[PDB]
Design a binder for this molecule. Structure first.
Ligand code: HEM
Ligand code: HEM
Ligand code: HEM
Ligand code: HEM
Length: 107
């Protein structure tokens, strides 16, 4: 089995880098994030060539990196999509977990 890496991982393909902590996500199954591709959970970096390697933040294809982290209605819950469900009607949690600035993802 692949092992979860250390906390403090920087996602840094963009000018708005974000820190990802596996430990705060330990209740989520690994494969919900490292989702199947060709029938096998894929543990490569999300923006690997052929994966979410389209760095145009308006792209909505399966290659759009922004889309994969921010949008609702995706085949796997995105970072923002899952956080919206988690926050519910709690506006303070919405700001913390889904805000575009001054949130836990973006300062
Ligand atoms: C579940 C226990 C689980 C495992 C196992 C796992 C592994 C894993 C690895 C090996 C990496 C490093 C990939 C690399 O080669 O750099 C990695 C990175 C990320 N993970 Fe993960 N991961 C597990 C669980 C989860 C869960 C539940 C999520 C989503 C909430 C998640 C997400 C990520 C993200 C994002 C990264 C960074 C990838 C990037 O492109 O740098 N993981 N994980
Ligand atoms: C890295 C942890 C990672 C994330 C995050 C991620 C997200 C993601 C989402 C949210 C979707 C659905 C988008 C939609 O519009 O429905 C999605 C879809 C696909 N991904 Fe992905 N993905 C991550 C990692 C990887 C890796 C490493 C690859 C390439 C091997 C990859 C590829 C794809 C493909 C292809 C799709 C479409 C799959 C389908 O069943 O339709 N992703 N990803
Ligand atoms: C997608 C790569 C992704 C990111 C980025 C992300 C970030 C994140 C942060 C910054 C926190 C706050 C705690 C910390 O600093 O680690 C946080 C918290 C929760 N998340 Fe998350 N998260 C991403 C993805 C996902 C996905 C796909 C889910 C659900 C399927 C999810 C869930 C949660 C939950 C639950 C928490 C705790 C909420 C709380 O109130 O603290 N995240 N995430
Ligand atoms: C609020 C809906 C929101 C906005 C707007 C937003 C914007 C944003 C930008 C402009 C980028 C860079 C895109 C580029 O290629 O230039 C970016 C990148 C990431 N974001 Fe974001 N973002 C918003 C909210 C959130 C939230 C609440 C999270 C965490 C749950 C989050 C996550 C991410 C991640 C991950 C990236 C990629 C980081 C990297 O690889 O550099 N965003 N976002």
């Amino acid at each position: 089995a692949p092992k979860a890496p250390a906390d403090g991982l920087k996602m840094d393909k963009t000018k708005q880098p974000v820190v990802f902590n596996h430990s705060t996500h330990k209740a989520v199954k690994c494969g919900d994030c490292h989702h199947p591709v060709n029938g096998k959970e894929d543990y490569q970096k999300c923006a690997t060539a052929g994966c979410h390697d389209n760095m145009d933040k308006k792209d909505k294809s399966a290659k759009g990196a922004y889309h994969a982290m921010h949008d609702k209605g995706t085949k796997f819950k995105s970072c923002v999509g899952c956080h919206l469900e988690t926050a519910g009607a709690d506006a303070a949690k919405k700001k913390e977990l889904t805000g575009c600035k001054g949130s836990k993802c973006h300062s």
